[PDB]
Design a protein around this nucleic acid. Structure first.
Length: 1023
DNA sequence: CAGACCATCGAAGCAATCCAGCACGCGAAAGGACTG
DNA sequence: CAGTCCTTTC
DNA sequence: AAAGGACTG
RNA sequence: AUUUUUGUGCCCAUCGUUGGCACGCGUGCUGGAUUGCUUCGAUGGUCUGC
């Protein structure tokens, strides 16, 4: 039984200045009262101590000392009341309290990094003492009270729901059946320590009503006791649960100091109301308990990570870090393994040791006075080798520091190679683990959820009561506004009074609200509705069209019934003088395990994210027998989202813009401006086949470089920058798709504005964002426009890709059965070792974003389920033959004509053929792919590794002409057209390799199938 | 062979953005009182 | 009693 | 322990 | 309790054919990166008599 929330983000229509001011006063009252509860609960937690937490003692792995340190040592902003503790003396303070020194978990908590500029430790136990002093309540009485709170889960970790805490500590009356319930439970266990129903009924109770009226009154029935009795009249492991619940129901809830605390709250906050106090405490506890749990898990993670630091490589770390106090360095920084080609330095030192052996054997002979020259030659050779290594490893990752490698080689006798790697990775991991900031306890900006059951009373009126009201008072009965009846506290006269406010969210109408007076599509409108749509102002026409479609669907009985149910929350966040009603809604799923389809998707960056469906227990013509599971490919395609312009049909995700054949004035203006500032590179971007957003991106980079060169006149660039990014018909803001290139375009636009500002404000105080806002307010506004446009662009890309994925999942669910959407677990990209360009490229991936959006959407549909799989080798594994018997791991190719072969392709083929050891597992797969490429056409690598790439193209053309085919497959590390043994593409062109007769599928579709077979066995057990 | 010019590549500082994780909120069901 | 609200407990 | 996942429209 | 004028937005050389289409919101921190300026250091090369 899973559940998630919807959200409809409505718009508050000001009913009247008086009513809106009343609502604002109520909101301000709640907001002003929230900090009081925040501080009060910080004090309560501060009062925690041993003999308070030594009760249930239930906790995952948190030490009894870490709980104490968490509840009375919190990092908060410097500008707060509890201020006054420095990190150094945290240990001795924790010694002063609790009569013991910090343990490992509490030592890690105290010795945690943070931002000393903004956040400061805080004693949090002088705050409890200040509560005792300023409310003058006996320390013993407050000790009893907060011990009772802890046992009631009103303080500590895993707190209870705010409503419950308020009702318990500040409530009128009670069951008072604590001792009564304890006796009942002791009797029940004594009768155990449908038959259980008889045993429970033996509590001097005839039926459920009697025991309800005797043991547990005025609440929901105790754990499966009254419901159990009813079920049994209309397993033995529960004894431990009932015995551990006996800790409760023993105290009788006598508060020795909650009266004084309640009076203090009434002094600071208004008079006690369960709804108001519950809301304020709900918005005050969230930061407290949230950051408490976050820091507990964080400290556990920190101890686990520090246990992974070897700490025996520390001397090697010292030797390597001696780089900073050596002639080769000219400030000081941390050394990460990417500075030495993390694992390639082994090959580097192999080569350098070969050179050293040659040099030494040459120095043994030639013992004349030529040493001063031979050593110089050897020094030059080793320097050249190190430079070549840095250049070589600087293609797939960051260039290793030349000076660091020179220093390491100079210290070739003080440290080995594996020891160099261990020391530097120690320097890296220790530094990382030591810079992990601890989460501060920051105050939440409140939400104040109005509901019906346990929150501040309130409700959307109804679709039914709406008709009653709109008919009682003469009205169309089909208004486009949603009315909420909120119980507002009139702060003038401190009493409650339900008022009404109008929301105007059209989605709520279209989807769950509008009444069925008489997933779907849309209706056919009438003439007058069309006229209204066409007569509305420009900015209102879209919402008018949506509303008229809704109205037509109601008038033509095309509007499905929406089964109101009155299950909507109302979240009112008052930022300034405007409200932010939200209308959340619970959705319940009842997850299913007996899957019938698997819908993997590959989640590419530039290559048109694909899906691929796989059946579970297929029985038909093609049913591939996996390890022990009969599976069948249903289909596989691309995720293309269609925006149908007048007659064409674009893919927002891959359109890439118009072809510059219709942007000639645009390109002419750009060239005219660029000519004024120094153009053989412009002509390479302005071809009439080049697409518009490639042209815009490349021209943004051109402007960036131009501004860099003409630094002292970057103010002259602003007219062109505007005309390119904002104003003109073909601009980054006027015209841009969801394609990856259209996001690189916004990235380069933001970079262009950044360089314009950096060179417009450079003459040394730093250039703060306020300084550049004041320097060119229009350009800063343009920067904000680009940022907001790109953020909404990203939100829409996530939403639409996830919509297509979930739509195909629903199609398969309707056709076959419960679907399982398997997505790559694309984490830990954008690494330090990678190049800056690689990390920037991978930032636009939005893999985890789409995965999260699909995860959310799947929680609302019954039948779908989303698991995230390991993305390892999912682009090479041959689907349905890899792991069906044994791993296959073929390579990806690139069909092309011999005339369009480039130098890069030939060099890549040679790199595959060159028998050199590499740590990448896929090197073997692409090497065997290159061998098979040579075998297929008989190229005789010795004679194929030759020069004259033109001669290579001629030889390939002759080989492919002797055969009747037109294109040659050849392995490429970034090529499509994977070779599968099964037809997974639906456009696959069969081909003959050494002698296997593969299918030329699409690398995207086979990768989607692999994503659908990563752990197929786990999803489908043999049951 | 001394000297300067480009260029890219690292490191750090400074000021910014950004995708992402992750903790929390978006309570239920009951009885009594009340009202119609 | 239907529906409301206000409370306590799960 | 990375690599892999991505492959610069 | 009636405001009849809006939830957020996304795509397009013709911005409408009723254009086409999608959507969980908020707070707060944290992690990893990126962007821009500068400083420093390496790396590669053209150039002037040598």
């Amino acid at each position: 039984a899973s559940e998630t929330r919807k959200a409809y983000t409505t718009k508050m229509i000001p009913r009247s200045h008086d009513r809106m001011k009343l609502l604002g006063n109520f909101m301000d009252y709640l907001m002003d009262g929230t900090p009081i509860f925040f501080e009060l609960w910080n004090q309560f937690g501060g009062g925690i101590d041993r003999d308070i937490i030594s009760g249930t003692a239930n906790k995952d792995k948190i030490s009894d000392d870490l709980l104490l340190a968490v509840n009375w040592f919190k990092v908060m902003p410097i500008n707060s009341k509890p201020q006054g503790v420095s990190p150094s003396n945290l240990a001795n303070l924790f010694q002063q309290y609790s009569g013991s020194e910090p343990d490992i978990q509490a030592q890690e908590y105290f010795a945690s990094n943070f931002d000393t500029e903004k956040h400061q430790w805080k004693d949090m136990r002088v705050e409890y003492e200040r509560l005792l002093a300023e409310l003058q309540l006996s320390r013993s009485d407050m000790h009893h009270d907060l011990k009772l709170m802890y046992k009631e889960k009103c303080i500590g970790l895993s707190l209870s729901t705010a409503h419950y805490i308020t009702s318990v500590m500040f409530g009128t009356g009670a069951k008072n059946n604590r001792q009564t319930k304890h006796q009942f439970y002791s009797k029940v266990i004594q009768l155990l320590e449908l038959a259980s129903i008889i045993l429970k009924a033996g509590d001097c109770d005839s039926y459920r009503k009697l025991r309800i009226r005797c043991s547990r009154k005025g609440a929901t029935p105790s754990i499966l006791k009254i419901v159990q009795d009813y079920e049994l009249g209309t397993v033995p492991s529960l004894i431990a649960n009932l015995k551990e619940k006996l800790g409760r129901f023993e105290y009788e809830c006598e508060w020795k100091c909650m009266e004084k605390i309640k009076a203090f709250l009434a002094s600071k906050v208004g008079p006690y109301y369960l709804g108001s106090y519950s809301a304020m405490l709900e918005n005050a506890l969230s930061p407290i308990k949230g950051m408490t749990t976050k820091n507990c898990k964080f400290v556990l993670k920190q101890i686990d990570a520090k246990n992974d630091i070897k700490y025996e490589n520390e001397p090697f770390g010292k030797i390597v870090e001696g780089f900073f106090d050596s002639p080769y360095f000219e400030v000081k920084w941390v050394l990460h393994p990417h500075h030495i080609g993390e694992s390639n330095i082994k090959t580097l030192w192999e080569d350098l040791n070969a050179i050293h052996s040659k040099y030494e054997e040459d120095i043994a002979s030639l013992s004349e006075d030529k040493k001063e020259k031979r050593i110089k030659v050897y020094q030059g050779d080793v320097c050249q080798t190190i430079n070549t290594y840095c250049e070589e490893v600087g293609k797939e990752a960051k260039t290793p520091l030349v000076q660091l490698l020179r220093y390491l080689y100079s210290r070739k006798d003080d440290i080995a190679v594996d020891k160099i790697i261990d020391g530097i990775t120690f320097l890296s991991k220790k530094h990382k683990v030591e810079k992990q900031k601890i989460n501060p306890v920051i105050q939440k900006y409140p939400s104040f959820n109005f509901g019906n059951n346990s929150k501040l009373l309130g409700k959307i009126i109804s679709p039914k009561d709406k008709l009653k009201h709109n008919l009682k008072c003469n009205r169309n009965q089909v208004d486009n506004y949603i009315w909420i009846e909120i119980k507002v506290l009139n702060t003038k006269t401190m009493r409650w009074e339900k008022h009404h406010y109008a929301l105007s969210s059209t989605r709520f109408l279209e989807e769950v609200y509008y009444p069925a007076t008489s997933y779907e599509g849309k209706p056919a409108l009438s003439a007058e509705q069309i006229e209204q749509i066409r007569s509305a102002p420009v900015g209102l026409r879209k919402v008018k069209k949506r509303q008229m479609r809704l109205e037509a669907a109601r008038q033509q009985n095309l509007l499905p019934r929406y089964t109101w149910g009155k299950d909507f929350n109302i979240n009112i966040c008052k930022r300034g003088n405007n409200f932010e009603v939200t209308l959340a809604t619970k959705v319940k799923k009842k997850k299913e395990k007996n899957y019938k389809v698997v819908l993997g998707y590959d989640a590419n960056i530039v290559r048109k994210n694909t899906y691929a469906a796989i059946e579970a227990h297929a029985n038909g013509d093609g049913v591939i027998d996996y390890n022990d599971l009969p599976v069948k490919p249903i289909e596989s395609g691309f995720v293309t989202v269609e925006s149908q312009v007048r007659d064409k049909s674009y893919d927002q995700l891959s359109y890439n813009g118009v072809k510059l054949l219709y942007c000639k004035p645009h390109v002419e203006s750009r060239r005219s401006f660029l000519e004024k500032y120094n153009m053989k590179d412009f002509e390479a971007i302005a071809d009439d086949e080049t697409s518009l957003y490639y042209f815009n991106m490349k021209y943004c980079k051109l402007l960036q470089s131009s501004i860099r060169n003409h630094s002292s006149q970057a103010k002259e660039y602003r007219e062109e920058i505007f005309e390119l990014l904002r104003d003109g018909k073909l601009s980054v803001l006027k015209l841009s798709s969801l394609s990856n290139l259209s996001f690189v375009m916004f990235k380069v636009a933001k970079s262009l504005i950044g360089t314009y500002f950096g060179h417009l404000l450079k003459k040394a105080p730093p250039i703060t964002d306020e300084d550049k806002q004041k320097a060119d307010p229009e350009m800063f506004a343009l920067r904000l426009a680009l940022e907001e446009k790109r953020l909404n662009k990203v939100k829409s890309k996530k939403e639409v890709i996830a919509n297509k994925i979930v739509a195909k999942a629903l199609e398969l669910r309707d056709k076959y059965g419960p679907v399982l959407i398997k997505g790559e677990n694309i984490s830990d990209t954008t690494k330090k070792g990678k190049k800056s360009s690689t990390n920037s490229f991978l930032m636009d991936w939005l893999a985890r974003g789409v995965a999260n959006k699909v995860k959310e959407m799947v929680m609302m549909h019954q039948g779908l389920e989303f698991v995230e799989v390991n993305p390892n080798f999912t682009s090479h594994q041959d689907p349905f033959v890899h792991k069906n018997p044994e791993n296959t791991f073929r390579a990806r190719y690139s069909r092309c004509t011999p005339s369009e072969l480039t130098e890069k392709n030939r060099k890549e083929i040679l790199s595959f053929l060159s028998d050199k050891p590499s740590k990448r597992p896929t090197n073997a797969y692409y090497n065997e792919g290159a061998m098979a490429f040579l075998a297929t056409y008989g190229l005789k690598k010795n004679d194929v590794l030759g020069v004259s790439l033109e001669k290579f193209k001629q030889i390939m053309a002759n080989i492919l002409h002797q055969r009747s085919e037109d294109q040659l497959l050849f392995p490429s590390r970034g090529g499509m057209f994977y070779l599968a043994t099964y037809k997974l593409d639906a456009d696959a062109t069969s081909v003959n390799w050494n002698g296997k007769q593969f299918w030329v599928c699409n690398a995207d579709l086979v990768a989607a199938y692999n994503v659908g077979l990563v752990d197929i066995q786990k999803d489908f057990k043999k049951k």
